[PDB]
């Protein structure tokens, strides 16, 4: 029975808690870490560390992490696996994220950063903040998994407002921790467990992600198409010497469809790729199967 | 006055960290008090009552400059447990302030403190437990050595005895069993009884009572120093089906166990969400 934490940490990682926490996301604790009371307040994440209460500077951010790592360790003592995720560019989850990251891999849990590059459209400042914050978490986490949100406007709705498009990357970041929790919390037929988990994510590196879900006739191996072509994996699938495909459905998802998507990923994938395949049971799914896809080693 | 009034307070972030799984845990009947001593950061409670007051001496100050307000959120009190939980930090240095205030008071003061993995290291934790015993009755102290395997394991390990040293007493004193203790006996035996250890068995099924109380006797966080107490409490958790015949052969073996001139509090808890398991908390004071 592993335990897991999912870190969101500034506003941004706060709201991507929250928004796991609306959508019913089940077998793992939250933890909101900000530096913002108010906020935190309307969080219902369980539990909430307001830091650098003294004090968008990434600078700032790192030292109010830093000043509170005792606190930090003491939430994430017991986790078999931490997830770190923010919104880079801004200060407290640029600056914050790779001491949470730092902590939770000192202390053995198998460390998964999950973070958003921030639009272009939000200027170069918080685009190389972000970049800087994500080499930097680089370091300090097993596996990173990278979303730009530019990719994200290719798809979706193209009179997206500015607040879908943010809504958006939250989503997707629920969608990054998901895809891989559920395989341990909520199985199918194909029980991927801890173990397995925590050997294709160890040291794997920076990591891109890609999603597809369809419904009806040959929606898994639609839904897996999807996932491999989509433009958050920046068409480097066929690079990838790790991967970890995650199916969920109904309590009817067959092994048949399972294994045509499965057979699809790897006909897609490197020749010498390590992929691992593993099943979901959601029964909130109805007629749909959602296929998650996380790429290392390239 | 009668239903004896408990406060349970946390204070610095591993203290209040403790209240807030204890909360999450469905502790019952007792007061949960929050004290954060951290100027840069808080932790967040869901606990009753919520005090910021926000190093050892920073802690130590913090609760002194705020003692007029901790003693009106004390005031009432039968008994009052102070932890500063797992870790170090602003929470060491207020604990005590926070025990001697309770204990001016009259409330049957008691603390909690952990004594950290030797894998840890050290960078104060031995100063933080001389001043905490000063101000306290009892202190409980929980060597998390003594629990040793991956390092996840051991630090759930000791989370959850922590939580024990203090619903083990409480549950006791709260929720009753068919046998129910004194509180009178319980402030009789712990007032300024010093320095306590803790033990917890547990098992299910046939011989279960025996079994767990065997256990918890023998427990290593007991550091063999139940033959040489002078006062024991003992509580058996269970559901409500509990002989008691086998309570009495569990109570009979740590009469047996223990110093013959020991005083010796014992009880039982109707806890129906264990199934057919028994948990057994054995708590030894004096030499």
Redesign the interface.
Known sequence: LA?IKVVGIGGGGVNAVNRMIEQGLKGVEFIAINTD?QA??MSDA??????????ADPEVGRK?AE??K??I???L????MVFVTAGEGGGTGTGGAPVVASIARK???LTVGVVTRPFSFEGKRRSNQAENGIAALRESCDTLIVIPNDRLLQMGDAAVSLMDAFRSADEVLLNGVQGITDLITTPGLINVDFADVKGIMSGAGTALMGIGSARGEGRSLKAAEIAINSPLLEASMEGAQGVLMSIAGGSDLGLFEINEAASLVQDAAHPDANIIFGTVIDDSLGDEVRVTVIAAGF
């Open positions: 335990v009371a935190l307040l369980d539990v909430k560390l307001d830091v650098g209460r003294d004090s109010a000043d509170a005792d606190e360790e003491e939430l003592r017991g986790a078999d202390l053995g849990a």
